[PDB]
């Protein structure tokens, strides 16, 4: 994990902010990722995360779902541009997702890889299926659901070891956050890879929309972000 | 619309009635109970049959293609029905003479109907005079009974 600390000294000196949060990370007060989120700041410059999540750029926390070209007409023929769906996040607890556009497949991919650096959000975890009574973050804690477009889906815990079981453009974006074993009930139309992606990721957001009282914390081993490096 | 029809405790009888009725508006259910695939099926619902040939004709394909596939007409033995057999294998038509006993299979497409460009056929060749046709497609075997 060396290079992904060398990048900190490579980057922190080679950039001046244009926003404010830029400063409040550049000058040594806030230096730990998990204390910038739950306060309603704004993320507009895509380096603040790199300076604290410097493994997001590793070509392995990065995943590229699909390229799809779209068309429109003008009175001089066709005009055509690409959209790629790209998601990223370290393989510990944090994931982000972006679309982007552009007129060439490169510019598209890079633009999207950048957009998906800002939205990035964090999770909870657990193990609370009726079998894995263990307490180690290898499954989503409690059955929750999320909606988008014309697709609903509700995730269910499951025992340590049952391999990922969801559609083929869900296995990636579940693998990134490392959620390994989880069972799937689908509705709607799973053939627009986009709304699929966005609905799954929305559910994983909603993971933090239910109140778990003090005691239940030590029933499923809920965590937040990294746990036991 | 409201909650649901007999969503009470005791009215299960009505509920079984509701399901027993609305089950019929299907299409695979009916085509089985009343056994309609039976008694409209020039083989009486079986996986193969034998026949005799009558002619040698040719058919044209779907709208956006081009060609004249060859075709034969078999007269069945099980029923006296007269059914339409297509034969694959380039130029296989060089062999099927008038009055040769042949075998007939399906073509296994949508619903069991036809497939591809030849829309009007439903039956293809496998064996002639007890000889597997794929052979004569690449020769590789000789032919009995002339």
């Amino acid at each position: 994990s060396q290079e992904w600390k060398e990048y900190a000294k490579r980057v922190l000196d080679e950039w001046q902010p244009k926003t404010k949060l830029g400063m409040l990370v550049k000058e040594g007060q806030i230096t730990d990722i998990h204390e910038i989120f739950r306060k309603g700041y704004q993320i507009k410059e895509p380096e603040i995360i790199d300076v604290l999540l410097p493994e997001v750029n590793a070509r392995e926390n990065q995943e590229i779902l699909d390229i799809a070209l779209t068309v429109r007409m003008t009175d001089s023929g066709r005009r055509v541009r690409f959209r790629v769906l790209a998601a990223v996040g370290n393989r510990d607890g944090y994931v982000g997702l972006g679309i982007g556009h552009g007129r060439e497949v490169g510019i598209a991919i890079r633009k999207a890889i950048n957009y998906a650096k800002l939205n990035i959000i964090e999770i909870k975890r657990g193990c609370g299926s009726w079998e894995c009574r263990c307490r180690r973050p290898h499954s989503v804690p409690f059955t929750v659901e999320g909606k988008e477009g014309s697709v609903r889906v509700k995730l269910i815990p499951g025992p340590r070891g049952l391999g990922l079981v969801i559609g083929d453009v869900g296995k990636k974006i579940l693998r990134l956050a490392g959620i390994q074993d989880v069972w799937s009930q689908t509705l709607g139309e799973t053939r627009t890879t986009v709304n699929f992606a966005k609905a799954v990721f929305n559910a994983l957001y909603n993971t933090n929309k239910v109140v778990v009282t003090p005691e239940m914390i030590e029933r499923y081993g809920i965590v937040v972000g990294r746990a036991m490096p | 619309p409201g909650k649901k029809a007999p969503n009470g405790e005791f009215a299960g009888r009505k509920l079984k009635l509701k399901r027993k009725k609305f089950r019929w508006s299907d299409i695979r259910y009916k085509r089985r109970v009343l056994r309609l695939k039976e008694k409209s099926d020039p083989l009486e619902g079986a996986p193969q049959a034998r026949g005799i040939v009558l002619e040698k004709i040719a058919v044209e394909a779907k709208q956006p293609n081009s060609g004249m596939r060859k075709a034969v007409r078999v007269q069945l033995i099980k029923n006296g029905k007269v059914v339409t057999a297509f034969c694959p294998g380039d130029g296989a038509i060089k062999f099927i003479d008038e009055h040769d006993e042949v075998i007939i299979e399906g073509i296994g497409g949508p619903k069991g109907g036809s497939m591809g460009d030849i829309p009007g056929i439903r039956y293809k060749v496998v064996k002639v005079n007890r000889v597997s046709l794929k052979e004569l497609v690449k020769g590789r075997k000789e032919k009995p009974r002339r």
């Binding site: 079998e131 894995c132 009574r133 263990c134 025992p159 340590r160 070891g161 | -």
Partner: protein, 175 residues
């Protein structure tokens, strides 16, 4: 109603072409020199049944379900796939690779009985190894725990004298 049939003892794969799955089992298909793909899935099945037993006894309770659970540990450690005391849940922390070891081919190899994998196999299947004073001819036997150590050559085999010059190739590698 209808007489009893004799089931197959495994489970083919749902879809046989998941590219990165073929090129995952690929290596193990050589790393032990098995012969046909089935020669593996049998064991995967053997594993999935152990696990399917692990869960269910963990979400019931009752006089017999308990003993039927606690008469398991005796086995799955008597075979040797487990530590001495792994309390039930550890049973889920098992791999294809642990079972894959207890094959007689590997064990007769990790004890230096011959040069490599594709040759320990023949040394068995021509009848030279011997278990607890008994021939075997099964390149897929699962040697237990009680017998890994009581294993030598055959009392009538052309090898059982340090003068079969092919036997005298076997030491040179050992070092």
């Amino acid at each position: 109603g209808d007489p009893k049939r004799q089931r197959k003892k495994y489970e083919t794969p749902p879809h046989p072409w998941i590219k990165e799955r073929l090129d995952r089992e690929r290596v193990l298909m050589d790393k032990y020199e098995l012969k046909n793909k089935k020669e593996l899935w049998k064991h995967e099945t053997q594993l999935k049944n152990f696990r399917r037993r692990a869960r269910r006894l963990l979400a019931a309770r009752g006089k017999q379900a308990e003993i039927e659970r606690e008469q398991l540990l005796a086995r799955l450690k008597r075979l040797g796939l487990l530590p001495e005391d792994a309390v039930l849940d550890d049973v889920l922390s098992l791999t294809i690779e642990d079972i894959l070891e207890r094959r007689l081919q590997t064990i007769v190899y990790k004890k230096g009985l011959a040069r490599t994998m594709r040759q320990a196999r023949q040394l068995i299947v021509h009848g030279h190894i011997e278990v607890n004073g008994q021939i075997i001819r099964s390149p897929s036997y699962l040697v237990l725990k009680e017998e890994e150590d009581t294993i030598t050559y055959a009392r009538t085999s052309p090898f059982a004298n340090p003068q079969h010059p092919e036997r005298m190739m076997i030491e040179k590698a050992k070092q």
